[PDB]
């Protein structure tokens, strides 16, 4: 089942598209999860919003200027918070001569310019904005209400974790980046590109994720000594030439407007935006995730870092392992190749 662990793309019909969780179980039955990242092209009939002509006055309250320091394919990104600005104000800066996408032929050419110019002319990313651009009545793949077992957190506790069980928007310009990371608590993510220029992605198969972490620790041994989970700080940029040079398997994919990407538990990903765009994202879970959450290596050294109590999940879905887990004796090893139990339907 996807033995190459390559990024797969799916084209669901509207009947297949309707049940979100059941379609994630399906793509896993096809091996999609082995790559760490999958693309889903929604049916042509489906639109999450009638038009995006009305969002220019939307406030980006904490835009980030992205200062990148480094060389030889290894970089640290320092996110400087700027004053609030509207989407109109942001698009003007994005599309300006100073910040707009360079001219280019093939994607590989734009990819080279990004890795060459990453540390110059720091861009502004309208990142981590609370909100959704879904119209209230869109019932299929609505990032505001996906209906997965991750809803157990708020249902049980009342706790909302912004961007994790609530939606975030990302207004990009050229050369804006997301550093190497897995999701908080090693969850899944969903990412829909509402409009604009593409978003390109790098992915490491979950089954080789530990190899990426070992490599990253050797390259940033200071950071590793102060925090086991330093990649969770979302500051570490590593080029695909460095991954290739140190034998880390990875794939790349470019997401276009109107496409979803799905990241899988313990799937390391990074990337960049090609130009002015807008993506929406949130996290979600399947039953397969519960073990990932139990075993997630968490960031020690920072306040406001995302932690989820696994108790409720182990009680409900692994009641036989509860007392053993609670006693610290649960030695389950994760097999990254296995699809979620909900996939049994298709297998």
């Amino acid at each position: 089942l996807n033995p190459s662990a390559r990024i797969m793309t799916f084209y669901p019909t509207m009947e297949e598209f309707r049940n979100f969780s059941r379609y994630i179980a399906y793509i896993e039955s096809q091996g999609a999860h082995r790559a760490g990242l999958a693309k889903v092209v929604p049916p042509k009939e489906w639109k999450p919003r009638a038009s995006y002509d009305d969002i220019d006055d939307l406030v980006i309250p904490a835009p980030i200027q992205q200062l990148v320091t480094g060389q030889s394919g290894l970089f640290t990104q320092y996110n400087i918070q700027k004053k609030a600005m509207t989407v109109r104000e942001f698009r003007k800066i994005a599309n300006s001569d100073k910040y707009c996408t360079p001219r280019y032929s093939e994607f590989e050419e734009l990819e080279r310019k990004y890795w060459k110019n990453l540390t110059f002319n720091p861009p502004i990313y309208g990142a981590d904005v609370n909100g959704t651009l879904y119209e209230k009545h869109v019932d299929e793949w609505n990032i505001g209400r996906l209906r997965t077992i991750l809803d157990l957190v708020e249902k049980e506790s009342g706790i909302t974790i912004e961007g994790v069980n609530t939606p975030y928007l990302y207004f990009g310009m050229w050369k804006t980046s997301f550093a190497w990371h897995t999701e908080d608590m090693d969850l899944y993510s969903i990412n829909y590109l509402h409009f604009g220029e593409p978003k390109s992605w790098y992915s490491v198969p979950p089954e080789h994720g530990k190899r990426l972490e070992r490599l990253a620790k050797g390259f940033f041994p200071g950071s590793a000594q102060s925090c086991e989970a330093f990649l969770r700080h979302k500051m570490t940029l590593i080029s695909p030439l460095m991954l290739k040079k140190y034998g880390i398997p990875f794939d790349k994919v470019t997401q276009e407007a109107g496409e979803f990407m799905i990241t899988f538990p313990y799937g390391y990903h990074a990337g960049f935006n090609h130009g002015f765009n807008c993506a929406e994202s949130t996290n979600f879970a399947t039953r397969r995730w519960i073990e990932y959450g139990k075993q997630a290596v968490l960031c020690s050294c920072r306040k406001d870092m995302v932690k989820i109590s696994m108790d409720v999940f182990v009680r409900k879905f692994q009641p036989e392992r509860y007392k053993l887990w609670k006693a610290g004796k649960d030695n389950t090893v994760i097999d990254h190749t296995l699809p979620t139990p909900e996939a049994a339907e298709f297998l």
Partner: peptide, 11 residues
């Protein structure tokens, strides 16, 4: 435990 925010600390 539960809590936090996904938005990483800005500088």
């Amino acid at each position: 435990s539960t809590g936090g925010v996904k938005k990483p600390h800005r500088y």
